[PDB]
Amino acid sequence: SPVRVGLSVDASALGHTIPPDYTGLSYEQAQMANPNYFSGANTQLAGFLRTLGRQGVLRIGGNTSEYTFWNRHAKPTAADEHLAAGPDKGHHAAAREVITPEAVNNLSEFLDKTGWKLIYGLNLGKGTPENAADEAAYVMETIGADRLLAFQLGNEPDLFYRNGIRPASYDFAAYAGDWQRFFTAIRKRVPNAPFAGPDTAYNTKWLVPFADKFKHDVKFISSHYYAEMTIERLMKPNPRLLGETAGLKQVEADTGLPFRLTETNSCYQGGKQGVSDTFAAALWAGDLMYQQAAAGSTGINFHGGGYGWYTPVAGTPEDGFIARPEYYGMLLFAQAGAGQLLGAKLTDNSAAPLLTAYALRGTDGRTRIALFNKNLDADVEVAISGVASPSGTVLRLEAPRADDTTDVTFGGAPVGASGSWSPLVQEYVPGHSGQFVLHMRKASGALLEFA
Ligand SMILES: O=C(O)[C@H]1CNCC(O)(O)[C@@H]1O
């Protein structure tokens, strides 16, 4: 007994344009202590990034960016030649790590194998303005202007008052004083240096005051989002999401600087075993990419590394890399590709309320629809109107249970080594122009492409 829902596509209801560099990943700065990780020799990880997008952004930052120190004469230690730095769990201070010129040289070679651009964290929490300027000069020289999208001056500065990085009295005004001092030092050595911020954890009250004070000094505004957890809770809206969406919309409405979600994943403190590492996270992540794009976001960076519960890609240079379940929701987005969002209204859906749908006119002119049946107990039958085409094909995003940590496929295939992926099962959509009908099992996703 599927829940019978209507989906009306309205090509006259033009939404936001999704740019080619929308997709992205975030890693801990501590990983730059291992020059083998972001390296030309890491062909496996480079292939996972290429499969997520021809263009995209690598963001390096996180809690460890306050505990990582640039040393222009240093070489890496024994332990850090083998370091796989997973997401910081945010319980206490991270271990001190050193970043070497060799690590920045190898990062350039890595980025050049991918086509991706870089957002690079500087140490405003514990470092000096002069050391930041020295690091920025080396990064700008080596990575180059076309691949360096932005420096960010600290990670989650809105938590320095609580985590001991600053006094209890630290507030936006104190942060703006620190930010101006680092900005001035860096621009003295790197007059072309680009910036973004404030890279906040959650405090939306900082976004527009940052944008207004530093309007002539930044390329875009950035903030973070974590949904925390149970799988049922992850499939629903929550107040924190509503607040972050409202913050993004205030930036777009009050400034005309673009916004990027520079660090996001399902559950903070490194994720939750049984939620973040499950097929549910693929549906959560693919739905999030579209919801934020529909709300006016220019891009996203899913946090990860090591074998963290929420990482899209898990592994090490020594042991190899694998796509975790969340990767498959980002792979649906990659396959849908860039374009402009169209209206897509669901009706008769109160029985299947966690079903989401997004329509897109691709750069090639063809209509695509991304659906996420996030209902854990309801199959749906989707009557699709407003789409004119002889023919459509469906790629399904599936696992046998929402809590599965494996068995995830897209287009009837898993991702293989080095991000290898091609569709092996493609089905025609039942119906004809102006009336297509699509069945979806409970807890599943679909990408429809029309001729
Ligand atoms: O708590 C987490 O999972 C995140 C929160 N944001 C900072 C971080 O990326 O360093 C951390 O790993």
User: Can you give the CATH number for the domain in which 433 is found?
Assistant: 2.60.40.1180
In 3-state terms, what secondary structure has residue 389? coil
Q: How many CB atoms lie within 10 A of CB 323?
A: 26
Residue span of the structural domain in which 408 resides: 2-19+338-451
Final residue belonging to a domain, choices 337, 353, 388: 337
Do 166 and 284 fall into the same domain? yes
Helix (H) or strand (E) holding 195: strand 195-200
Final residue belonging to a domain, choices 302, 337, 372: 337
Method used to determine the 3D structure: X-ray
> How many residues comprise the chain?
451
Do 179 and 50 fall into the same domain? yes
62 CA → ligand 1 middle, Å: 6
280 CA → ligand 1 middle, Å: 20
Do 113 and 234 fall into the same domain? yes
- Distance between CA atoms of residues 28 and 67, nearest Å: 10
Do 439 and 325 fall into the same domain? no
* Six token digits for residue 30: 């501590």
Do 45 and 146 fall into the same domain? yes
Is residue 414 within 8 Å of residue 339, measured between CB atoms? no
Residue nearest to atom 4 of ligand 1 (CA): 268
In 3-state terms, what secondary structure has residue 207? helix
In which residue are the tokens 């529909």 written?
294
- Distance between CA atoms of residues 301 and 60, nearest Å: 10
Could you list the beta-strand ranges (E) of 391-434.
392-398, 409-410, 427-428, 431-432
Q: Running DSSP on this structure, what letter comes out for residue 23?
A: -
Nearest ligand 1 atom to alpha carbon 310: 3
Q: Name, in order, each residue with C-beta under 8 angstroms of 77's C-beta and a sequence gap of 6 or more.
A: 33, 98
Helix (H) or strand (E) holding 131: helix 129-143
Do 293 and 391 fall into the same domain? no
Do 133 and 267 fall into the same domain? yes
Is residue 346 within 8 Å of residue 373, measured between CB atoms? no
Helix (H) or strand (E) holding 357: strand 355-362
Nearest ligand 1 atom to alpha carbon 224: 6
- Distance between CA atoms of residues 25 and 27, nearest Å: 7
State residue 230 phi and psi, 5-degree precision: -125, 165
* Six token digits for residue 45: 């990880």
Q: What angle do CA 139, 141, 144 make, to 5 degrees?
A: 85
- Distance between CA atoms of residues 134 and 388, nearest Å: 57
CA distances from 339 to 22, 217, 342, 358, 392 (A): 11, 29, 10, 12, 18
Residue nearest to atom 5 of ligand 1 (CA): 268
Radius of gyration of the chain (CA): 22
* Six token digits for residue 397: 């995003």
Identify the CATH number of the domain in which residue 294 sits: 3.20.20.80
CA pseudo-torsion sign 180, 182, 184, 190:
negative
268 CA → ligand 1 middle, Å: 6
Q: Which alpha helices (DSSP H) does 202-352 contain, by range?
A: 207-213, 231-234, 239-255, 279-294, 325-336
Do 34 and 112 fall into the same domain? yes
Residue nearest to atom 11 of ligand 1 (CA): 88
Do 14 and 46 fall into the same domain? no
Do 243 and 376 fall into the same domain? no
Could you list the beta-strand ranges (E) of 106-194.
117-122, 148-153
Give the dihedral of Cα atoms 307, 29, 110, 134; nearest 10 deg: -170
Final residue belonging to a domain, choices 337, 364, 393: 337
Do 123 and 247 fall into the same domain? yes
- For the chain, the domain total comes to 2
Ramachandran area for residue 122 (φ above 0: left; ψ -120 to 50: alpha; else beta): beta
